[PDB]
Amino acid sequence: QDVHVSFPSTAGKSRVMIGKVEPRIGIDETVPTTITVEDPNEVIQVNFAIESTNKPFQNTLLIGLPNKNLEMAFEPEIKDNGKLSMYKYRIDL
Amino acid sequence: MITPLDVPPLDYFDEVFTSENWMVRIYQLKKDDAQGRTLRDVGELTRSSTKTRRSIKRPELGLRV
């Protein structure tokens, strides 16, 4: 994560599951944008996207409504071996 | 036969009258606290806790609406 790139795989697990997982791209450029992936596994719907251009010190995921100040930050699960570093966010709805 | 280690204290009510032979006890609902905290926390505040010992911790309260 220091001198190498990384990969983010936000997984949205759900005991009660009802989701559509839409996406849009209209914002100022932060030099990191990639398309998300999908899956059809049992109770794990991984989403793969590589926006790991810049150097991380903080690495957090905010979930909620920003217009009414309802946010929730989640803890990353980083795995760095050798030169390859990866992230893992686990969201439980 | 009962003992004072029985009869847990009363943190929402307070007695205002008790007859001579202790027949008819009259209690009052004391008003809810001004700072919004529950009255058992006022009761455990004002006594028995905690030997001038503290603890500092992430209070695990969720999120504000």
């Binding site: 957090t60 905010l62 100040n69 946010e71 929730m72 930050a73 | 992430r58 309260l61 999120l63 609406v65």
Partner: protein, 53 residues
């Protein structure tokens, strides 16, 4: 408490945020700028998130 007629800045040299209980009496006035966090010299957990402090 205060309503800004126009956009302005408010300086905060070094600060500390507060986690708030969901009581009726508490009147929030200003918010952490939604991209902030807390750190310590010790290896403790982060106190508040971005916009909840």
């Amino acid at each position: 408490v205060y309503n800004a007629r126009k956009s302005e800045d408010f300086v905060f040299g070094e600060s500390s945020a507060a986690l708030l209980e969901n009581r009726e009496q508490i009147v929030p006035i200003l918010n952490a700028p939604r991209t902030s966090f807390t750190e310590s010299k010790g290896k403790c957990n982060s106190w508040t998130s971005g916009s909840q402090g």
